């Protein structure tokens, strides 16, 4: 779709995180890995269903133009959504533990130190946690 270059670079960034072997095609295996890393439990048939829905050319994998059409098509309830993925407390704060859990689930095997370090740089008021404003701030927007 017709978005800004910054938007396109962002979606390429997301795409590259799905496409772990870098061949330019997201497979059901690759989609399954991402989803499961984020706490979801899709079946193989459900993964094929998801790929099929996005796979506009029928080759059984998702390329970048197909992924872009997906991401391209109210506009700030998804920032809370992202925060929600981290705040498993629904207590309004991402803890060191909660961030650690997500970040490690995503393959970034961080030591408790690196985690605490990450928390320390994001934490603007110093309460030991990351609230909604500190989160959006790290996102940039």
């Amino acid at each position: 779709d017709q978005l800004t270059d910054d938007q396109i670079s962002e979606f390429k960034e997301a795409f590259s995180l799905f496409d772990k072997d870098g061949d330019g095609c997201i497979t059901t295996k690759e989609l399954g890995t991402v989803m499961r890393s984020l706490g979801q439990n899709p079946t193989e048939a459900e993964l094929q269903d998801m790929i099929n829905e996005v796979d506009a050319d029928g080759n059984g994998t998702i390329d970048f133009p197909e992924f872009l059409n997906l991401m391209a098509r109210d506009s700030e309830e998804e920032l809370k959504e992202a925060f929600r993925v981290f705040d498993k407390d629904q207590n309004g704060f991402i803890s060191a533990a909660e961030l650690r859990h997500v970040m490690t689930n995503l393959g970034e095997k961080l030591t408790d130190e690196e985690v605490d370090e990450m928390i320390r740089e994001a934490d603007v008021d110093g309460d030991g946690q990351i609230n909604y404003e500190e989160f959006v701030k790290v996102m940039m927007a």
Binding site: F18, V34, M50, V138, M140
Partner: protein
């Protein structure tokens, strides 16, 4: 039979309408399933980007 002729007209129109309803029923399913799957994949992509921001800082 006047009554039989008029009933034949109505029956034809009803069958056409029925076919249209069967089809619309499918279009609704399809649009809902499509939105569902898309919002699902999008929410995961946004989660990944959120994570990546923490790495980028």
């Amino acid at each position: 039979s006047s009554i039989e002729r008029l009933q034949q007209w109505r029956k034809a129109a009803l069958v056409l309408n029925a076919s249209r309803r069967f089809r619309y029923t499918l279009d609704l399913k399809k649009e809902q399933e499509t939105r569902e799957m898309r919002q699902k994949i999008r929410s995961h992509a946004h989660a990944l980007l959120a994570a990546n921001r923490f790495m980028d800082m």
